[PDB]
Amino acid sequence: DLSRSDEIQKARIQLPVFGEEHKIMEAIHHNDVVIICGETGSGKTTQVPQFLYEAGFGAEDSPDYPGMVGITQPRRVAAVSMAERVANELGDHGHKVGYQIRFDSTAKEDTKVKFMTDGVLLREMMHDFKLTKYSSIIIDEAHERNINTDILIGMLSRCVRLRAKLHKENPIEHKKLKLIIMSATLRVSDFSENKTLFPIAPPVLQVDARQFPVSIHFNRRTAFNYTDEAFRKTCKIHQKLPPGAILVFLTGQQEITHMVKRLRKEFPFKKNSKYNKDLETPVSKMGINSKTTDLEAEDIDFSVQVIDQDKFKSAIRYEEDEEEEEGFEEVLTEGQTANDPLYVLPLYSLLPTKEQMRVFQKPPQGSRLCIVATNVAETSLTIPGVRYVVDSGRSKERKYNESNGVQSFEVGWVSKASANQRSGRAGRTGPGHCYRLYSSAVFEHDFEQFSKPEILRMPVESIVLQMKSMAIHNIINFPFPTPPDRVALSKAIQLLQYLGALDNKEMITEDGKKMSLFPLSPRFSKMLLVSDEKACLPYIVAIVSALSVGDPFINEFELGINEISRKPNPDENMDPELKKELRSKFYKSRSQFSKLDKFSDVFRLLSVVSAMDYVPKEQKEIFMKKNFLRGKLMEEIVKLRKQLMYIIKSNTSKENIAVVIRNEDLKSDIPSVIQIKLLKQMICAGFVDHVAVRADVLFPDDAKITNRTSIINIPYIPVLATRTPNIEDCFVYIHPTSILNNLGEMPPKYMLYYSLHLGGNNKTRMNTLCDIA
């Protein structure tokens, strides 16, 4: 027999999924694949595994369902917390419940209900595709559309098909597999209507959760300093409004730690109270890297966007086209004071497990609970008693810049769907309030309706590399929920081959696996991997960071000081002396960063970035102004170098003991001559498919050229280019801003280019990196 406590079984009957047990189990008995949709707090994660367990799934001599019940989460916080909750709810059967969030954790013997991440199950499928240890797999939180979730759903479609075939043949020897996909929303047509996933559409069950009304309060304007605004709003809620918990939505650990410290200092418990160490978080993050667990966007610090208040405000100035703050008309109730202690706790994915469990316990009497969380608390779990939500409206998400191939992880607006999901957390126990730290205008105009599936926010070569690191062989025909185009997939496989991440039979190499460990686009990952020779790693880190952020050099044409037009075509129609003096100082400044190498634009980049570390704080602006630099880009490059250094150091160890890096660690020696030649080979490894040979070499005497041709007129041809019936439609040229223009000597024979550019219609121009010998 199974025996739960009175508290437990009475909590369960309130949950809307509990009431639909009948329809759910009926569908599961009649169908191998079932989709269940229900809002957060419905009881999906806690109750469906219990339904299966009570039905005999995993029972030690079940004739049809002896395998475990596996349930995946895209979020490891949810995996662990919801495992602990289900173990509690199973009473004297709770020992059957375990979890696994690390690759090399080996789970308990008697575990029959197993919570794990996405990536854990993907890895188990490498050793047993059929997942024979499992009677049922629940893919949870699918509406988040993380890349591993999409991949797992495709993999499981094949697995369930195969298990059904084998079970049809011999049911004593091969058991069926029940696949259940669970979603917070109805947006499941990429699963339910996808015929390559499910030839026969699975049933879609809807659970009708009862959410109390939540009053939505927009701020009048949208503050740039959202952490200060959230602190301010949280204090006002706490001091004026009746009992109930506060959930604050920030974007990452650093912000959360700082905000929790401010709140504890503002509303402490009495001096040397026991509670002022139940709140202590002596370890800000667990030792974690990509070798042991699947990094989530939230965990990765690699941001390339300039933060800038002026740019922010001008981007949203339409809100200035149209008195008290709304949502503060309720008052304190008896036994409350404006200065009650705040039982404030952090909640983010890097948080140690024992600390992350504190958020479900009741606050001590006479205090108010405040959870400062990332969007882990948006749909993946529920904090009891939340009456007030404070929404920064933002999150850290993966982004892919199509124009330059840079993958990064950036703070930006969430979708409207996500904002509404955040608000809803204030409506689980009773009517509540959500305080959005942004205007109704900004919400309307700049919050996208729906967030893009992560597969659409990735370099396709990253998608392919991840699947290949999971030993998924057939990429082209893989049943994606949202498939990339076959052409892009083929090109991505070929790129990974040029990078040596896939071999000639399209299988991952050892260097491929190492690259798959990095959160960067594979060209950059490759350059960092081959870089640990002759103390060259820091130079490559500087170069990758500069390329990721962008060109900090303001050029003559942007300064409006060019003597000759950018383009030679003769179309369209104080200041002079000053312009000539500006040109003088500009070419001097440029030359000052061109001393490491005479042919290589990438090394003038390295040069400014290196010089930047010797310019003390009070010189930055003078430095910037004197050198026509984009100071915000330079500062961002400093920050990114430090982030990337942390990423590498965290990867060297198995357990992360990487130390905070300080600005003084970036001080570089200027590279030696052989160091420079080597850097050129490393960069070339990242861009092997981008070499351009002077047309006069491949074809001498068959094409025009003269003694005094402008350098910018000297034709190059990318070796991998598609020769056309009329050839010259395919040549490319050196840009007039490059270092090469100051040669006079003839330009190199083999040049390495970052990319080619066609806007600016004279001719296709090269964005040059360096020469190849």
Annotated binding site for ATP: 38-45
| Burial letters 105-132, b for 16+ CB under 10 A, else e | eeeeeebbbbbbbbbbbbbbbeeeebbe
Q: What is the DSSP letter of 661?
A: P
Q: How many residues bind ligand ADP (CB under 6 A)?
A: 15
| Strand bridging mode 750-757 / 691-694 | antiparallel
How near is the Cβ of 41 to Mg ion at its closest, in Å? 9
Lookup: tokens for 335: 């036994």
| Shorter beta-carbon distance to ligand ADP: residue 140 or 771 | 140
Binding site partner of 382, from Mg ion, ligand ADP, none, Cβ cut-off 5-8 A by kind: ligand ADP
Per rule CB under 5 A, is residue 610 in the interface with Mg ion? Answer: no
Cβ-closest residue to Mg ion? 45
CA–CA distance, 679 with 673 (Å, rounded to integer): 10
**Which residues does the annotation place in the binding site?**
38-45
How many of the chain's residues bind Mg ion (CB under 5 A)?
A: 2
**Surface-to-core class of residue 187, CB atoms within 10 Å of its CB (0-12 exposed, 13-18 middle, 19+ buried):** middle
Q: Which does 545 bind (CB under 5 to 8 A by kind): ligand ADP, Mg ion, none?
A: none
Does residue 70 bind ligand ADP (CB under 6 A)?
no
Closest CA to 424 of 416, 415, 433: 433
Helices and strands (H, E) in the chain, number of each type: 28, 20
User: Which of 81, 234, 253, 469 contacts ligand ADP by CB under 6 A?
Assistant: 81
User: Which of 37-45, 250-258, 303-311, 458-466 is the region at the interface with ligand ADP (rule: CB under 6 A)?
Assistant: 37-45
Of 41-49, 130-138, 472-480, 760-768, the window that binds ligand ADP (rule: CB under 6 A) is: 41-49
Instruction: Specify burial of residue 614 (Cβ count, 10 A radius: 0-12, 13-18, 19+).
Output: exposed
Q: Max alpha carbon distance in the chain (Å)?
A: 96
The smaller minimum CB distance to ligand ADP, of residues 45 and 149, is found at 45
In DSSP terms, 246 is beta-bridged to 370, 388
Residues of this chain, 45-104, that bind Mg ion according to CB under 5 A: 45
Contact 596, 605 (CB under 8 A): no
Chain centroid to CA 348: how far? 14
Q: How near is the Cβ of 648 to ligand ADP at its closest, in Å?
A: 37
Core vs surface per residue 320-335: b (16+ CB within 10 A) or e = eeeeeeebbeeeeeee
| Of 44 and 468, CB closest to Mg ion | 44
Of the pair 163, 425, the CB lying nearest ligand ADP is at 425
**Of these, 43, 327, 427, 459, which contacts ligand ADP (CB under 6 A)?**
43
- Per rule CB under 6 A, is residue 398 in the interface with ligand ADP? no
Please tell me the distance from the alpha carbon of residue 496 to that of residue 91, in angstroms, as a whole number: 51
Choice from 18, 24, 34, 42 touching ligand ADP (CB under 6 A): 42
Nearest to 670 by CA among 768, 595, 769, 752: 595
User: Are 459 and 414 in contact, with CB atoms under 8 Å apart?
Assistant: no
* CB nearer to ligand ADP: pick between 360 and 750: 360
Taking the least distance from each CB to ligand ADP, the nearer of 332 and 357 is: 357
Neighbour order of strands in the sheet with 733-734: 716-718, 691-694, 750-757, 765-771, 733-734
| By the rule CB under 6 A, 113 interacts with ligand ADP | no
40, 117, 466, 607: which one contacts ligand ADP (CB under 6 A)?
40
CB of 71 to Mg ion, least distance (A): 9
Minimum distance, C-beta of residue 206 to ligand ADP, in the bound complex (Å): 12
The beta-strand segments (E) located in 350-461 are 368-373, 386-391, 394-401, 406-413, 432-436
CB of 226 to Mg ion, least distance (A): 27
Q: Choose among ligand ADP, Mg ion, none what residue 38 binds, the Cβ cut-off being 5 to 8 Å by kind.
A: ligand ADP
Nearer to Mg ion, 115 or 753 (CB): 115
Q: Is 375 in the site for Mg ion (CB under 5 A)?
A: no
Segment contacting ligand ADP (CB under 6 A): 33-41, 143-151, 468-476, 481-489?
Answer: 33-41
- Token digits of residue 407: 């993958």
Q: Which is nearer to ligand ADP, 292 or 420 (CB)?
A: 420
How many whole angstroms separate alpha carbon 420 and alpha carbon 443? 11
Q: Which of 32, 35, 45, 768 binds ligand ADP (CB under 6 A)?
A: 45
Q: Give whichever of 45 and 257 is closer to Mg ion, judged by the CB atom.
A: 45
* Least gap, CB of 54 to ligand ADP (angstroms): 16
CA distance 193 to 466: 26
CB 34, min distance to ligand ADP, A: 15
Instruction: Note the residues at the interface with ligand ADP (CB under 6 A).
Output: 38, 40-46, 81, 85, 360, 381-382, 384, 428
Instruction: Note the residues at the interface with Mg ion (CB under 5 A).
Output: 44-45
